[PDB]
Structure 1
Amino acid sequence: KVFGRCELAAAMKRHGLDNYRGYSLGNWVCAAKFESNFNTQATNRNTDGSTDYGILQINSRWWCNDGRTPGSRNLCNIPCSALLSSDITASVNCAKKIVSDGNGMNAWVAWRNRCKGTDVQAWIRGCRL
């Protein structure tokens, strides 16, 4: 599924991302745009063999099982394919664990370079929330 901006904001708010560990909702919408272009089916291979999956490009090195990243962990206890579904529940729950692990939202490269320090409220402006 390719989400609209306001559609995704509403879905993310419903699963409790708005102000999760102090990160306002516009930060999450901004990250998703630049990580995946709002597309749940996005995948991208990294140079060490791992792959990033879904709307927030979660990495098979630590977080999910894709059967081909040898000696990795699966700390969200899921197959990486559950992270490509049109329902974002599994992506959101896994991201809650990541953003809590000590590095906050800096774990998402595109957030650090394109969203951090900007007007992030602009990404939910106009939405009926």
Structure 2
Amino acid sequence: KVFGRCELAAAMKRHGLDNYRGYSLGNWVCAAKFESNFNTQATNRNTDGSTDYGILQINSRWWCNDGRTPGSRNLCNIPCSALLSSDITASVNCAKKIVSDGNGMNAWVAWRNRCKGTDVQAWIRGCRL
């Protein structure tokens, strides 16, 4: 799936991401834009032999089981294919575990480079929900 901006904002609002651990909804939409281009099937292979999956590009070395990444954890307790579903439930559920760690949203590099400290409010403006 490729989500529309306001389609995704409504979706993540319903999943309770607005102000989750002090991060306004705008930063979740911004993160998704620069991580995946709102593409729910997005995948990225890194040279180290892990893979980043889905709408939020969650990493296989720590968060999900891929069956292909050596010496790995799956802290979100999922198969990594679940992060490629058209429904964002699994990705939001795992991301909530990520931002609860102490590093916060700095876990996502695209957030860190293109969203952090900007007017993230712009990413939910012109939407109903």
TM-score > 0.5 by shorter chain: yes
Divergent runs of 4+, >3 A: none
Q: Give me the whole-angstrom Cα distance separating, in 1, the residues matched to 2:113 and 2:7.
A: 24
Residues 91-117 of structure 1 deviation map (CA, whole Å, 9 limit, x = unaligned):
000000001111000000000100001
Question: TM-score w.r.t. structure 2 length?
Answer: 0.99
Residue of structure 2 in register with 1:28 after alignment:
28
**Secondary structure of the corresponding residue to residue 44 of structure 1:** strand
2:85 matches 1:85:
yes
SS at match of 1:35: helix
In structure 1, the gaps of 5 or more residues are none
Gaps of 5+ in 2: none
Following superposition, the deviation at residue 47 of structure 1 comes to 1.6
Indicate the residue corresponding to 2:39 in structure 1: 39
Q: Hey, what's the Cα distance between the residues in 1 that align with 2:101 and 2:15?
A: 19
3-state DSSP of counterpart to 2:78: coil
Q: Write the deviation string for residues 31-62 of structure 1: whole angstroms up to 9, x where unpaired.
A: 00000000010000112110000000000000
TM-score calculated relative to the size of structure 1: 0.99
Query: Residue 104 of structure 2 corresponds to which residue in structure 1?
Result: 104
Q: Deviations over 1:73-95 (max 9, x none)?
A: 01111110000001000000000
**Take 1:6 and 1:120, find their aligned partners in 2: how far apart are those partners?**
14
CA distance in 2, matches of 1:47, 1:109: 16
Percent of aligned pairs with the same residue?
100
SS at match of 1:62: coil
